[PDB]
């Protein structure tokens, strides 16, 4: 029975699955897919190692709930990078059968309407908003499927509560129409202890497996000795050519024509511990594919930030580093190079662990102490689950390097297990949930309000709702007639997907901005769409004051109209208040975005502001999301003179462009530099680019360099000719299917 052809499956999807290598399932997937009425709608909650092909069952169930019972489906993923990878994977897997798959990730939204879509690959943040939109207009009959990758995220997380709110709201809808399902829910999780609780909460069937196609050997390293998980010595390591012996371990891994993952606790540590192995691989291997590696170097060299000095020293030896400091393009290039075997040693941080699927033969975790704290058991499991490539390696090795006292934390990580899932639900999450149900009209009376809380994970794990209702009533989010009805502010909060806690100050700030606005720059329209400071960078006070001393004769007008000062503007803090700190740290943040929408090169922004390019890109993505939310908030409040101003800044921040390119960047392959060089040559509209001379745009893309040197997000590397051919084809499709 274990064969993808025996199971009912489209021929096109079957032949696409044979391309990636999936031709015979495992026993665990069959036992999970044949777990009673799961194929009919009984929700499904299952656990498996990430290397065991967890998502195959989810994709099969989607194809089912989409083909047989034609309806929409949601694929909720934890992060934007993995969500985009899954969106492109599902697109390449489902294009032939005609299932329109599009993504709601970060700032990007599908050009086509959600009604035209058939699968929405969403982040946790945007899937909740999508379901809120479906409930408001009441199009909840379109939804028939919801898939939640990384179900364990529903516990303690900054975006996990939105996951719980996503399901307890759906279940109520299914359990209020009952006065094998109407909306199926399929969840993928890790080896959680209380998975059962989660399975019973969602009524889902529970499937737990521990099968790993490639066996895993986790071990600790103390001094020169290697011990297994159960405090048993397994090997006496002796360095081959050593000048921790981290480099010797990497050398031993490399000698057998394999690759290695090296998880370091910081960025500078990754850059240092990739330089070191590069130096030894030169000296130890030169007594002093290439072509593919030179292609990778050239791909990295035609980027807005260009080549990196440490990357330049490391990469032409098989060794490199992959941390959050690099741009998303550089990170994807390095990840692709490692995935193809071109890069053999990858010094990465913990951020990779939870990101893309990047398996390595040996995973060396330098220290059990990550960022001054012991490594998380979930983080450790995520790292060591990458040890072993399926279908290539016979085994996989994880080596955690510990010493002295550190040995204790290492053995604790070796013998530890995942903590149980939580609920995280007065509190902001419960306020959000109460507002979501009341404003959607799904629940009106307080008896219904407690009935809703009887459907949440808190009720399954085993007052607050009254406090939440009181808070929403006292803050004019909700009116009482005691039937609770949404107000205009309460409806606008649920529409623009913002926390009701933040929406109060957002309302005050926008209302103050309407009274006095500065239209002679884009800084006032940016201070409103600037999310916060958070921790996106470590602000240098002197640098800030210097920039401020050199602002146009019109910026400081915007600075003083929003709350910034000069007596406290990188002044007092220069030689050394919770709101003024949040204003200046928002002013600086709004200055950086000012250079992002002014098309300033990332390296120049880094030099003038001191923030690296990864932080700048993260900030611009967050600001674009916030701009979209603020635009919807003003749209639903009847603020036509502010929504009109904000309607373009989401795109101008997503792509970091000027207004002129806002039509060119609609093309998927025109980010902010293949559109500026294509705009200077006379193409200023997606109309002029549909018939743009093919060979002409090839020449233009060949010029202006900061074979497949051009790198495209989701398309990896593209040759100039193929790149601009796809550019003109995308322009043709955009202008042809939008009218």
Helix (H) or strand (E) holding 524: helix 524-527
- Residue in 396, 628, 656, 717 binding ligand WCN, rule: CB under 6 A: 628
DSSP string, 653-685: HHTT--GGGGTTTTSTT-SSSTTHHHHTTT--S
CB of 507 to ligand WCN, least distance (A): 15
Binding of ligand WCN by 166 (CB under 6 A): no
Is residue 359 a known part of a binding site?
A: no
Whose Cβ is closer to ligand WCN: residue 349's or residue 620's? 620
Is residue 713 a known part of a binding site?
A: no
Binding of ligand WCN by 491 (CB under 6 A): no
Binding of ligand WCN by 353 (CB under 6 A): no
Binding mask 53-92 for ligand WCN (x = CB under 6 A): ----------------------------------------
Q: Give the SS3 label for residue 52.
A: helix
Task: For residue 108, give the DSSP letter.
Answer: B
Binding of ligand WCN by 635 (CB under 6 A): no
* Cβ-contact 236, 225 below 8 angstroms: yes
Total chain residues near ligand WCN (CB under 6 A): 17
Is residue 52 a known part of a binding site?
A: yes
- Residue in 56, 58, 130, 664 binding ligand WCN, rule: CB under 6 A: 130
- Across-strand partners of 222? 225, 402
- Taking contact as CB under 6 A, which single stretch among the options 121-129, 445-453, 525-533, 714-722 is the one that binds ligand WCN? 121-129
CB of 631 to ligand WCN, least distance (A): 7
The whole-angstrom separation of Cα 689 and Cα 100 is 25
Helix (H) or strand (E) holding 137: none
Binding of ligand WCN by 629 (CB under 6 A): yes
Binding of ligand WCN by 625 (CB under 6 A): yes
- Taking contact as CB under 6 A, which single stretch among the options 501-509, 537-545, 594-602, 621-629 is the one that binds ligand WCN? 621-629
Burial of 30 (0-12, 13-18, 19+ CB in 10 A): middle
Tokens describing residue 252: 């031993």
- Taking contact as CB under 6 A, which single stretch among the options 87-95, 124-132, 637-645, 707-715 is the one that binds ligand WCN? 124-132
Tokens describing residue 82: 């993995």
Helix axes 613-636, 328-339, angle to 10 degrees: 120
Is residue 51 a known part of a binding site?
A: yes
Task: For residue 38, give the DSSP letter.
Answer: G
Binding residues among 688-707 for ligand WCN as defined by CB under 6 A = none
* Among 372, 445, 442, 369, residue whose Cα is nearest residue 412: 369
- Taking contact as CB under 6 A, which single stretch among the options 45-53, 127-135, 662-670, 712-720 is the one that binds ligand WCN? 127-135
CB of 665 to ligand WCN, least distance (A): 16
Q: 496: Cβ–Cβ under 8 A, 6 or more apart, which residues?
A: 503, 629, 630, 631, 632, 633, 635, 636
* Cβ-contact 122, 145 below 8 angstroms: no
CB of 106 to ligand WCN, least distance (A): 8
Binding of ligand WCN by 269 (CB under 6 A): no
647 — phi, psi (to 5°)?
A: -65, -20
Binding of ligand WCN by 139 (CB under 6 A): yes
Is residue 590 a known part of a binding site?
A: no
* Among 507, 508, 499, 505, residue whose Cα is nearest residue 436: 499
Whose Cβ is closer to ligand WCN: residue 410's or residue 628's? 628
Whose Cβ is closer to ligand WCN: residue 107's or residue 456's? 107
Binding residues among 496-525 for ligand WCN as defined by CB under 6 A = 496-497
Burial of 138 (0-12, 13-18, 19+ CB in 10 A): exposed
Binding of ligand WCN by 163 (CB under 6 A): no
Residue nearest to ligand WCN as judged by C-beta position: 129
Is residue 21 a known part of a binding site?
A: no
The whole-angstrom separation of Cα 257 and Cα 344 is 9
* Cβ-contact 595, 605 below 8 angstroms: yes
CB of 81 to ligand WCN, least distance (A): 17
Tokens describing residue 456: 């949440």
Known binding site for ATP: residues? Answer: 29, 48-55
Interface with ligand WCN by CB under 6 A: which residues? 104, 107, 114, 125-126, 129-130, 133-134, 137, 139, 496-497, 625, 628-629, 632
């Amino acid at each position: 029975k274990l064969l993808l052809a025996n199971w009912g499956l489209p021929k096109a999807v079957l032949e696409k699955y044979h391309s990636f290598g999936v031709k015979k399932m495992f026993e665990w997937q069959a036992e999970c897919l044949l777990l009673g009425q799961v194929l009919e709608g009984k929700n499904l909650v299952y656990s498996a190692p990430t290397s065991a092909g967890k998502t195959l069952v989810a994709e099969l169930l989607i194809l089912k709930r989409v083909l047989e019972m034609r309806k929409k489906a949601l694929f909720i993923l934890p992060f934007v990078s993995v969500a985009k990878e899954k969106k492109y994977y599902l697109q390449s897997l489902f294009q032939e059968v005609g299932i329109k798959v599009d993504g709601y990730m970060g700032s990007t939204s599908p050009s086509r309407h959600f009604s035209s879509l058939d699968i929405a690959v969403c982040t946790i943040e945007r899937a909740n908003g999508l379901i809120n939109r479906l409930i408001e207009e009441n199009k909840m009959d379109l939804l028939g499927m919801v898939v939640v990758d990384e179900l364990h995220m529903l516990g303690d997380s900054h975006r996990g509560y939105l996951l719980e709110l996503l399901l307890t709201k759906i279940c109520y809808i299914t359990r209020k129409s009952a006065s094998s399902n109407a909306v199926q829910i399929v969840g993928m999780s890790a080896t959680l202890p209380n998975l059962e609780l989660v399975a019973s909460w969602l009524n889902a069937e529970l499937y737990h497996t521990d099968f790993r196609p490639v066996p895993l050997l986790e071990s600790v390293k103390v001094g020169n000795s290697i011990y297994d998980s159960s405090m048993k010595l397994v090997r006496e390591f002796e360095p081959m050519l050593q000048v921790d012996h981290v480099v010797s371990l990497c050398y031993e891994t490399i000698c057998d024509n394999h690759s290695v993952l090296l998880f370091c606790p910081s960025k500078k540590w990754c850059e240092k511990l990739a330089d070191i192995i590069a130096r030894e691989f030169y000296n130890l291997h030169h007594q002093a594919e290439q072509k593919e590696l030179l292609e990778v170097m050239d791909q990295l060299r035609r980027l807005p930030s260009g080549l990196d000095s440490v990357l330049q020293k490391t990469v032409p030896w098989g060794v490199a580093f992959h941390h959050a400091g690099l741009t998303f393009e550089e990170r994807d290039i390095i990840e692709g190079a490692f995935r193809q075997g071109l890069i053999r040693v990858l010094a990465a941080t913990s951020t990779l662990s939870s990101g893309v699927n990047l398996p390595a033969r040996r995973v060396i975790i330098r220290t059990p102490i990550f960022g001054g704290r012991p490594l998380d058991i979930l983080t450790y499991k995520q790292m060591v689950g990458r040890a072993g490539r399926k279908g290539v390696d016979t085994v996989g090795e994880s080596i955690l390097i510990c010493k002295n006292s550190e040995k204790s934390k290492g053995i604790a990580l070796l013998q530890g297990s995942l903590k149980p899932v939580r609920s995280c639900l007065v509190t902001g999450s419960m306020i959000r949930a109460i507002l979501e149900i009341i404003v959607g009209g799904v629940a009106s009376t307080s008896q219904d309000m407690h009935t809703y809380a009887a459907c949440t994970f808190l009720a399954a794990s085993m007052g607050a709702i009254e406090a939440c209702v009181m808070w929403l009533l006292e803050n004019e989010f909700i009116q009482s007639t005691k039937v609770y009805h949404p107000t205009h502010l309460g409806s606008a909060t649920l529409s623009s997907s913002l926390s009701p806690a933040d929406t109060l100050d957002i309302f005050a700030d926008l209302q103050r901005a309407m009274k006095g606005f500065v239209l002679e720059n884009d800084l006032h329209i940016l201070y409103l769409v600037t999310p916060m400071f958070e921790d996106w960078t470590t602000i240098d006070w002197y640098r800030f004051f210097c920039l401020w001393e050199k602002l146009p004769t019109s910026m400081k007008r915007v600075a003083e109209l929003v709350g910034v000062e000069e007596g406290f503007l990188a002044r007092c803090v220069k030689g050394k208040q919770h709101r003024q700190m949040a204003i200046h740290k928002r002013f600086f943040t709004s200055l950086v975005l000012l250079d992002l929408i002014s098309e300033v090169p990332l390296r120049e922004i880094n030099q003038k502001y001191g923030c690296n390019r990864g932080q700048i890109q993260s900030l611009q993505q967050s600001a674009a999301v916030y701009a979209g939310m603020i635009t919807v908030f003003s749209n639903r409040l009847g603020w036509h003179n502010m929504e009109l101003l904000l309607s373009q800044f989401q795109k101008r921040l997503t792509f970091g462009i000027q207004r002129e390119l806002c039509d060119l960047v609609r093309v998927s392959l025109l980010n902010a530099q293949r559109a500026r060089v294509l705009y200077a040559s006379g193409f200023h509209t997606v109309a002029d680019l549909a018939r743009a001379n093919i060979v002409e745009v090839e020449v233009i893309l060949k010029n202006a360099v900061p074979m497949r040197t051009i790198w495209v997000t989701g398309r990896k590397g593209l040759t100039e000719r193929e790149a601009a051919a796809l550019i003109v084809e995308e322009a043709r499709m955009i202008l042809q299917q939008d009218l």
